[PDB]
Amino acid sequence: MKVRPSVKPICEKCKVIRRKGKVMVICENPKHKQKQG
Amino acid sequence: TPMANASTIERKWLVVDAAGKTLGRLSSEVAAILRGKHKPTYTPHVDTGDHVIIINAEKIELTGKKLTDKIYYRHTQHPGGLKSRTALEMRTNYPEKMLELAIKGMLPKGSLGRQMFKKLNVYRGSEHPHEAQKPEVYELRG
């Protein structure tokens, strides 16, 4: 769970979605999930 | 020399239904009829206003996401203490608070302001305690 203002898909099977106005990224690797801000 | 009326006034009793009128527009028009600015013989120091009664204070609706976004701050005079409650809060128990401070901020400030807020009463439901004043139903315009 990273909290970075810059959100990148770390690997190709991460996918970027928007929840509650804040951009997340979800991947089945739990090491790759972060929110923006 | 125009007539500045004093103690030549009759007070009407008005009923307005608040179930489907947003409190911003409702407060804005209710402040005007509380001022008596609808009355033609208005003077700014004798309170030619009209008694109004709210009906269904419980059913106000709010535009946008104000239902949980509007905060009602209040500050007791003791140090380091602030109280707040949201807009969807006090719908549960006292909408009369939301209305009463809405028209309190609506109408002018001063001794006449207190005396002129004095005429307004606000209740839940659709039931007057009083019918002896022969209250007529009036609708909003804007």
């Binding site: - | 125009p2 600015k37 609808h38 033609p40 013989t41 208005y42």
Partner: protein, 58 residues
């Protein structure tokens, strides 16, 4: 005077601004705010001016 005139116009279902606009294209209404206010205290005459302005407006 203006807010009294505004009340007089609104209770005939008219805005004050449209009222004076209609008066001005109705003619040179040299009648002014004080005596229009006295026309409010003689309101039937104020009605007799208001409908003339309204009917002239269109």
């Amino acid at each position: 005077w203006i807010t009294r005139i505004n009340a007089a116009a609104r209770m005939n279902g008219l805005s004050y601004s449209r009222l004076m606009h209609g008066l001005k294209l109705s003619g040179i209404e040299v009648n002014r705010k004080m005596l229009a206010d006295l026309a409010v205290n003689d309101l039937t005459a104020f009605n007799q001016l208001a409908d003339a302005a309204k009917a002239q407006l269109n």
